[PDB]
């Protein structure tokens, strides 16, 4: 099948290269990713200025291009300009560091796969859960095995899979729900050479979920976390309550 | 609701047209059916040669395509290329004639709905239990009412419903088990103009099930037969015996 690979750490990232190589063993792989590493860009897209692409190679069996856009921009370009609107699977990763809880909202890795989900194409976001010491190969190999055991018809429309792989040894895998893991921000103030102060964003993690089947608890125990997510943010319970009171 | 409608009698059958027109009154209907008779094709699929489709609108609220494939091919084509993997319900019928007992093994109607079950999509096979004098409208009317009261969450994975509606009065509905109804086969021999003999398959029905809750008994009493079936044929009882003996 025709597979599209992208990421948010840049086309030269080892995380995207190993992933492309392994997948190219049995499928037609196309790589379209940012020319340079992106930060917490969330689901940003480029509409106010033009986008540019550059054909670069990584090896045979794989056609690759780097772009001046975001991960979502990359998926839009690959689908319309490079793959003739014929894409069977989209994989965004392997990211350096975890993408769990509310942090998924500002994740470029997740954004790439979510763009695929909005187009109704089977998509997967995969991250190695250790920023300091990532294991790109381990995450990529897990993915190859998982694909042979997963029934994609079970993935509902506009739905993608957010996967986080433990950096150490993998005990197994679990289907999880997104946690409420978030951060308690704060800033450190400093002064520039001009006497003007600037601020550095900092923070401490908050893990207070009471449910046992959330993403970070699985990873903490050495299990791969697999969460099905979609682009629908309506709080149904709240909506029902509002309608009952204001009927 | 996005409903996929197919059949095994052919895209121009009165049974599929009646069903499609009535469902389109409240739902978004997509019809993908064979371009010819395929009643006794069973669960055959096309993998050695290409498949083709032809748009053949039937109305405004309904999009229709005929195909050179089998009923099962129709469902695969509908889900993957016509409906963009967005299917809420699959209905195969209304077939002209009954589909009960062992006859479901060679039924194109049941095969199409089974393709749905294999993808864990709510699916229904519906037939008007009288080949010579069917009541397509009646069967359709019944389904429409059934869809408004049945709770599909009750269906187990890989499970579909095989429904047979009496052609006369419908006294009500009953959840049944598949019967062992089959036929006493035999061939009539004839000779061609060139001296070569050919054979015509013929038969007489065998109704010898001693259980009272089987499909054909319900239909004979004037009640709709609703049987939950799945793609598993292992004879558990026999398997346990063979092991307890050998091993
Ligand atoms: Mg990154
Ligand atoms: Mg038929």
Swiss-Prot record, chains A, B:
Inhibited by vanadate and tungstate. Changing residue 9 to N: Loss of activity. Optimum pH is 5.5-6.2. It comes from the Bacteria. Its cofactor is Mg(2+). It catalyses: a ribonucleoside 5'-phosphate + H2O = a ribonucleoside + phosphate. It is found in: Cytoplasm. Its EC number is 3.1.3.5. GO terms for molecular function: 3'-nucleotidase activity; 5'-nucleotidase activity; exopolyphosphatase activity; metal ion binding; nucleotide binding. Belongs to the SurE nucleotidase family. Nucleotidase that preferentially dephosphorylates 5'-GMP and 5'-AMP. PANTHER family: 5'-NUCLEOTIDASE SURE, 5'_3'-NUCLEOTIDASE SURE. This is 5'-nucleotidase SurE. It comes from Thermotoga maritima (strain ATCC 43589 / DSM 3109 / JCM 10099 / NBRC 100826 / MSB8). The lineage of its organism: Bacteria, Thermotogati, Thermotogota, Thermotogae, Thermotogales. The gene is surE.
């Amino acid at each position: 099948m025709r597979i599209l690979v992208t990421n948010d750490d840049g086309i030269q990232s080892k995380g995207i290269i190993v992933l492309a190589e392994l997948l190219s063993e049995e499928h037609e792989v196309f790589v379209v990713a940012p020319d340079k590493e992106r930060s917490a860009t969330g689901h940003s897209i480029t509409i106010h200025v033009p986008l540019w692409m550059k054909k670069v190679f990584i090896s045979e069996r794989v056609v690759a291009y780097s772009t001046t856009g975001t991960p979502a921009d990359c998926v839009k370009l690959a689908y319309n300009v490079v793959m003739d609107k014929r894409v069977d699977l989209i994989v965004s990763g392997v990211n350096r560091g975890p993408n769990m809880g509310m942090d998924i909202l500002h994740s470029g890795t997740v954004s790439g796969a979510m763009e695929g989900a909005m187009m109704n194409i089977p998509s997967i976001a995969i991250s190695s859960a250790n920023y300091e010491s990532p294991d790109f190969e381990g995450a990529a190999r897990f993915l190859i095995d998982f694909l042979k055991e997963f029934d994609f018809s079970l993935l509902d429309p506009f739905t993608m899979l957010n996967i986080n792989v433990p950096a150490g040894e993998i005990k197994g895998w679990r289907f999880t729900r997104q946690s409420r893991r978030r951060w308690n921000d704060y800033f450190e103030e400093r002064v520039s050479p001009f006497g003007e102060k600037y601020y550095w964003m900092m923070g401490e993690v908050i893990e207070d979920d009471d449910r046992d089947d959330v993403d970070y608890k699985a990873v903490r125990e050495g299990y791969v976390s697999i969460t099905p997510i979609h682009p629908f943010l309506t709080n149904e319970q709240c909506l029902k309550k509002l309608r009952e009171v204001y009927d």
